C-alpha cells in the first residue's frame, strides 16, 4: 500500500505498537480516566513482558 | 442528448467553444444555444412515451 510504504510520513497514523499491520487503531492517548487500563502512552516505555 | 460523457464532447460541439467565448466577452450577448436543445429533447421524450 502507498500508505503502508510511506508510513511514518502519513498524517493520520496512531502509535504503531503492532507488527503485522500498522493501521490497527491505537487509541491509548485519548483514554479518559474511567476505563483506562494503564496502556503505554505513545512516548513512554512498556511494562514487564515488554512484548 | 449528446454523448454519455462530457470528455468526448469535442471542442466544435461544446456550448462554450472559443467562438462562443469571444462572443460572450461583450455584454448582453446570450446565444439561444441550449434552450432549443432542451425543448427538442423534451419533445422527443414525449414522442418516445406516446
Amino acid at each position: 500500500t502507498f500508505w503502508s510504504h510511506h508510513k511514518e510520513k502519513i498524517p493520520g497514523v496512531s502509535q504503531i505498537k503492532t507488527l503485522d499491520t500498522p493501521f490497527k487503531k491505537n487509541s491509548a492517548f485519548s483514554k479518559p480516566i474511567a476505563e483506562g487500563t494503564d496502556q503505554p502512552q505513545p512516548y513512554e516505555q512498556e511494562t514487564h513482558p515488554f512484548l | 442528448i449528446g454523448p454519455e460523457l462530457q470528455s468526448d464532447l469535442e471542442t466544435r460541439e461544446k456550448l462554450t467553444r472559443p467562438i462562443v467565448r469571444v462572443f460572450q466577452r461583450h455584454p448582453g450577448t446570450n446565444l439561444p444555444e441550449a434552450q432549443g436543445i432542451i425543448r427538442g429533447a423534451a419533445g422527443l421524450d414525449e414522442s418516445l412515451l406516446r
Binding site: - | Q6, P27, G28, A34, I37, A42
Partner: protein
C-alpha cells in the same frame, strides 16, 4: 434590499458544469462594459448570479430577459433543414432526414 429567488431551467447534459461569461468579469474594460449595461437598462450588472450555467441548467432569472435572448434566429426553416446541401457536415444525416417527410 430586494429578493433574488434564482430560477433555473431543465437539466441538460451538454451544459458544461459552471460557466461565467467574461463580460461580467473583464477587468480591463469594465468601466466601459458596466456603463454599457447601465445605458442599455435591461442587462443587470449585479455581482451574484454570474454563472448562467450553474450545474447543468440555464439561469432563467436576471441574466438578460427572455426578450433579446429568444430573438436570435437566423431565419431557420424545416423546409430548408430537411434538405441539407451536400458540401456541409449536416448532409450525413440524409439517411435519417428523408424519413421525416415535410408538412411544417
Amino acid at each position: 434590499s430586494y429578493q433574488s429567488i434564482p430560477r433555473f431551467s431543465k437539466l441538460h447534459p451538454v451544459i458544461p458544469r459552471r460557466y461565467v461569461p467574461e463580460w461580467k468579469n473583464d477587468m480591463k474594460n469594465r468601466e466601459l462594459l458596466v456603463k454599457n449595461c447601465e445605458m442599455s437598462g435591461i442587462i443587470p450588472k449585479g455581482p451574484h448570479d454570474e454563472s448562467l450555467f450553474l450545474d447543468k441548467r440555464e439561469r432563467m432569472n436576471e441574466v438578460e430577459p427572455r426578450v433579446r435572448v429568444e430573438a436570435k434566429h437566423p431565419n431557420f426553416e424545416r423546409y430548408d433543414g430537411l434538405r441539407p446541401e451536400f458540401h456541409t457536415a449536416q448532409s450525413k444525416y440524409q439517411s435519417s432526414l428523408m424519413f421525416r417527410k415535410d408538412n411544417t
